[PDB]
């Protein structure tokens, strides 16, 4: 345990998040998408010695939707339970980098003030929080998962316009959903849910985030 297999987890979670970022539209390199565990150890020169800062090594920037806002950032805290101290240093790093988005992946628990500070952060800036064990398996790989697409405000505008649909009338979607957390979807935003239909052949629905 924590001797070799751990690298596989760190590899698989790295690919899962990269695919997630890739799914977010960020131009992850195919090789990063394609790399093997053997290559993953090779890419990081992994395991010259034990308990090495792989989580510091795993820490990465990801960047590229086709809309060049650029610069999303992913950080992996070394401490299982993350404190405000690491959050301030992180806050300093994201500020100094002036990144647009920061994703922090915590191993275990957190102080509620850090949890609070993460929630509020800044009215004009976003910080993202992901638990490592939940990342350990890509839920979107599951067969029961429909295709989810975030809708542009104009698409939402067009959607309401075409139907004369009232905002209330739209089914709500709870932001407590892991998948909601996956898209990084915000409240009030709409996600396009694409489903197979045993009747239509194809069924599309939408839900506003609550």
Partner 1 sequence: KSMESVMVKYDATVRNSINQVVQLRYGEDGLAGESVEFQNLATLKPSN
Partner 2 sequence: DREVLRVIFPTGDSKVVLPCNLLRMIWNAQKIFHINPRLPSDLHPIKVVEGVKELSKKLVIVNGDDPLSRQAQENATLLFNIHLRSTLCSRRMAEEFRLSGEAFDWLLGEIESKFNQAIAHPGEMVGALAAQSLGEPATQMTLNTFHYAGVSAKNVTLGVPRLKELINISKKPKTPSLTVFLLGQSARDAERAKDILCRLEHTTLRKVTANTAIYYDPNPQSTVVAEDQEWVNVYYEMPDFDVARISPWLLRVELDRKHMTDRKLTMEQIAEKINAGFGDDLNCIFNDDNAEKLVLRIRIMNSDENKMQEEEEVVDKMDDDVFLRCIESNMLTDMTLQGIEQISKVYMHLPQTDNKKKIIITEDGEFKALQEWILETDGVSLMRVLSEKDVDPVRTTSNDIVEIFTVLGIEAVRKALERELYHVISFDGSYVNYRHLALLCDTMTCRGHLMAITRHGVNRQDTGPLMKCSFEETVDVLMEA
Q: Which residues lie near partner 2 (CB under 8 A)?
A: 133-134, 136-139, 141-146, 148, 158, 162, 171-174, 177-180, 193, 196-204, 207, 210
209, containing H or E segment: strand 203-209
DSSP E strands in 34-168: the ranges are: 60-62, 72-75, 101-106, 126-131, 147-150
In whole angstroms, how close is the CB of 180 to partner 2 at the nearest point? Answer: 7
Give the one entry of partner 1, partner 2, none that residue 165 binds, where binding means its C-beta sits below a cut-off of 5 to 8 angstroms depending on kind.
Answer: partner 1
Query: For residue 169, with 0-12 CB atoms within 10 Å meaning exposed, 13-18 middle and 19 or more buried, which class applies?
Result: exposed
Which residues here bind partner 1, judged by CB under 8 A? 163, 165, 168-171, 197, 199-200, 203-205
- Taking the least distance from each CB to partner 2, the nearer of 120 and 198 is 198
| DSSP conformational letter for 200 | S
Give the one entry of partner 2, partner 1, none that residue 137 binds, where binding means its C-beta sits below a cut-off of 5 to 8 angstroms depending on kind.
Answer: partner 2
Give the one entry of partner 1, partner 2, none that residue 96 binds, where binding means its C-beta sits below a cut-off of 5 to 8 angstroms depending on kind.
Answer: none
Q: Are 117 and 84 in contact (CB under 8 A)?
A: yes
In whole angstroms, how close is the CB of 42 to partner 2 at the nearest point? Answer: 21
- Report how far residue 193's alpha carbon sits from residue 179's, in angstroms, rounded to the nearest whole number: 12
- Taking the least distance from each CB to partner 2, the nearer of 6 and 97 is 6
In whole angstroms, how close is the CB of 193 to partner 2 at the nearest point? Answer: 6
- Taking the least distance from each CB to partner 2, the nearer of 85 and 172 is 172
120 C-beta neighbours (distance < 10 Å), count: 8
Q: Are 123 and 165 in contact (CB under 8 A)?
A: no
- Taking the least distance from each CB to partner 1, the nearer of 48 and 201 is 201
Give the one entry of partner 2, partner 1, none that residue 24 binds, where binding means its C-beta sits below a cut-off of 5 to 8 angstroms depending on kind.
Answer: none
Give the one entry of partner 2, partner 1, none that residue 138 binds, where binding means its C-beta sits below a cut-off of 5 to 8 angstroms depending on kind.
Answer: partner 2
- Taking the least distance from each CB to partner 1, the nearer of 83 and 146 is 146
- Return the HEC string of 71-101: CEEEECCCCCCECHHHHHHHHHHHHHHCCCE
- Report how far residue 5's alpha carbon sits from residue 1's, in angstroms, rounded to the nearest whole number: 7
| DSSP conformational letter for 110 | B
- Taking the least distance from each CB to partner 1, the nearer of 121 and 149 is 149
């Amino acid at each position: 345990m924590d001797d070799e297999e751990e690298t596989y987890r760190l590899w698989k979670i790295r690919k899962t998040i990269m695919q997630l970022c890739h799914d977010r539209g960020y131009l992850v390199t195919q090789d990063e998408l394609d790399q093997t565990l053997e290559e993953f150890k090779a890419q990081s020169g992994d395991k010259p010695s034990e308990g090495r800062p792989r989580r510091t090594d795993l820490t990465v920037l990801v960047a590229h939707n086709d809309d060049p806002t650029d610069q999303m950032f992913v950080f992996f805290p070394e401490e299982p339970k993350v404190g405000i101290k690491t959050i301030k240093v992180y806050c300093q790093r994201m500020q100094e980098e002036n990144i647009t988005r920061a994703l922090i992946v915590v191993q275990q628990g957190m102080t509620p003030s850090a949890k609070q500070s993460l929630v509020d952060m800044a009215p004009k800036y976003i910080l993202e929080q992901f638990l490592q064990q939940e990342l350990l398996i890509n839920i979107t790989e599951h067969e029961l998962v429909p295709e989810h697409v975030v809708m542009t405000k104009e698409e939402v505008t067009e959607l309401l316009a075409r139907y004369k649909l009232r905002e209330n009338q739209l089914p709500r979607i709870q932001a407590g959903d892991p998948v909601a957390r996956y898209f990084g979807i915000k409240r009030g935003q709409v996600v396009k849910i694409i489903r197979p239909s045993e009747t239509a052949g194809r069924y599309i629905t939408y839900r506003l985030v609550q």
